[PDB]
């Protein structure tokens, strides 16, 4: 069976009784500091600290001025000069907030077109490069060091409906996005053009110049498919050169562009084939906006469903379809799980729910 066994050690619930839409552990936390995770739901973000005996210690929240803000997503990075962690949050107002997680001060914020942001992701090798996916059909890439919009990934050949999820590949050379138009789309960011644009974003200082920073309008993905799912594609991750993606059809598909022997870096915009390498089925998850996560090493994969059941897959197997499943249930956990998060060391798994409950599963 599955190499990984968890026991439920604690549970709690936030005062607001709104859905907790996102949970992220901080993977940039220093050696010897306790494991910290952030939740988003309602118009706030909250930080907790994990301790022994399953204790989840409440710290401090950032509550938005606007009572109409609903936070959907968060991501951790760090300040590239001082070593300090940063937390970006976003939601329905379409405003990105950079939060100092110590004081919970909002350091600065970015405004796109002001339409819901569904997901945020930081570059795996550049802590400054923030990617946001939006209800307005577009993805934007930001440089949060020089406070510049590097590019908009949109256009007619872009997504024709909400973008719900996106992921950088390992070296942060290409992005794969997905959304309500049933399509998964590839956008390379290692082209001459984009590497140059990123470099220019680093040279830009508004006080040393007269020009505004000109962003790139990227209107053509480098690959596209609608052959994986038959509904809203709400979650995507890279597993090396392979893709893991889901819709609301109770399945996580493992797939790649082109035929079996096709190299990912040789795939052209016209490519018409994909190759299904496997599919992990589960039950009762046919609402949309239900995100799986993986641990740091990508050894395992966790997904909650709509009645409070957790699925964990052991990916540490020769081929994708050989993955080992185990399930985590609790009698008092009955509300929908929106997202899971592993700690960096993999000893703790956190699930969050539509009833504002938080569930802590510790690894045996």
């Amino acid at each position: 069976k599955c190499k990984y066994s968890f026991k439920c050690v604690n549970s709690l619930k936030e005062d607001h009784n709104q859905p907790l839409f996102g949970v992220q552990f901080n993977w940039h936390s220093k050696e010897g500091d306790p494991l910290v995770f952030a939740t988003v739901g309602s118009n706030r973000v909250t930080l907790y600290e994990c301790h022994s005996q399953g204790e989840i210690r409440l710290l401090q929240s950032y509550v938005d001025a606007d009572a109409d803000e609903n936070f959907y997503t968060c991501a951790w990075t760090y300040d590239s000069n001082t070593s300090h962690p940063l937390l970006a949050v976003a939601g329905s107002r379409g405003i990105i907030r950079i939060i100092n997680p110590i004081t919970m001060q909002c350091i600065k914020h970015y405004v796109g077109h002001g339409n819901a942001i569904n997901e945020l992701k930081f570059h795996p090798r550049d802590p400054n490069l923030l990617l946001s996916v939006s209800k307005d059909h577009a993805l934007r890439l930001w440089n949060i060091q020089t406070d510049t919009l590097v590019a908009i990934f949109g256009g007619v050949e872009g997504h024709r409906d909400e973008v719900l999820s996106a992921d950088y590949d390992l070296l942060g050379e290409k992005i794969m996005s997905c959304g309500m138009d049933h399509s998964l789309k590839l956008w390379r960011i290692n082209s001459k053009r984009m590497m140059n644009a990123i470099k220019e974003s680093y040279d830009y200082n508004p006080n040393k110049t007269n020009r505004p920073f000109i962003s790139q309008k990227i209107h053509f993905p480098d690959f596209s498919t609608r052959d994986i799912h038959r509904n809203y594609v709400d979650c995507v991750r890279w597993l090396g050169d392979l893709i893991l993606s889901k819709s609301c059809e109770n399945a996580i598909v493992c797939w790649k562009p082109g035929k079996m022997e096709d190299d990912i870096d040789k795939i052209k915009p016209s490519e018409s084939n994909v190759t299904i390498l496997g599919r992990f089925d589960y039950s009762q998850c046919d609402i949309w906006y239900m995100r799986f996560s993986t641990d740091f090493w990508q050894k395992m994969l966790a997904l909650g469903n709509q009645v409070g059941k957790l699925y964990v897959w052991d990916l540490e197997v020769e081929d994708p379809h050989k993955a080992k499943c185990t399930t985590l249930t609790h009698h008092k956990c009955g509300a929908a799980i929106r997202q899971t998060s592993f700690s960096r060391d993999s000893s703790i798994l956190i699930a969050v729910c539509d009833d504002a409950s938080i569930w802590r599963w510790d690894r045996l």
Binding site: P19, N231, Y232, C248, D286, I287, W288, Y289, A336, D354
Partner: peptide
């Protein structure tokens, strides 16, 4: 396809 149990 709803975000939650009977939505819009």
């Amino acid at each position: 396809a709803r975000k939650s149990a009977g939505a819009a």
